[PDB]
Amino acid sequence: DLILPFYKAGKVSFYQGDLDVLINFLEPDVLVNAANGDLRHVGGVARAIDVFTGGKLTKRSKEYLKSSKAIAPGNAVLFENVLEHLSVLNAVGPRNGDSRVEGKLCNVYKAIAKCDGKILTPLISVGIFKVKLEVSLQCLLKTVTDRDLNVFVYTDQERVTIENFFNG
Ligand SMILES: O=P(O)(O)OC[C@@H](O)CO
Ligand SMILES: [Cl-]
Numbered sequence: 001d002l003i004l005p006f007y008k009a010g011k012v013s014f015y016q017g018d019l020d021v022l023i024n025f026l027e028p029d030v031l032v033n034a035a036n037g038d039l040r041h042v043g044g045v046a047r048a049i050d051v052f053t054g055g056k057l058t059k060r061s062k063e064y065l066k067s068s069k070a071i072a073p074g075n076a077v078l079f080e081n082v083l084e085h086l087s088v089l090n091a092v093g094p095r096n097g098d099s100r101v102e103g104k105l106c107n108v109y110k111a112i113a114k115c116d117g118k119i120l121t122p123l124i125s126v127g128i129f130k131v132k133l134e135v136s137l138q139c140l141l142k143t144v145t146d147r148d149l150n151v152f153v154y155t156d157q158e159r160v161t162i163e164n165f166f167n168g
Contacts, residue, residue: 015151030078030115031087031119033122074107105124106139109124123152134161
């Protein structure tokens, strides 16, 4: 109620604050990570998420990668209870100029959609992966059509660009 998304489109809400406050206020069950393929969270949003978990995310990721194949853009694996009652799914998105940049992204959002509970997710493969926002948003917006979802908006730019993208 008393922290309001700066924009709501359908069942989808957009919040730009810092991660602690938001996660604390929204009480999500799954937090989505804009992930590597090899789960190295060295900057951007995945860095934040990791710190947020006191690095427990990284810890789990390494282990994960010693009995499991790296992650193909277009997919996601969920780590349950990374912190108590908080799960992270690492969704790897496409880098700008792979094949089916679009159909990959879509699957990601599709995976994100199937998760149970309240979700908070950054906009996918839109940072150092360099896919333009219009596309990711468009994918997400198009793919997850009937589900409450909370997009974490990570920077002032992400914000402006999202503003434009809703020009009515
Ligand atoms: O997928 P994006 O959002 O572009 O970021 C990749 C990131 O995991 C590198 O640290
Ligand atoms: Cl950064």
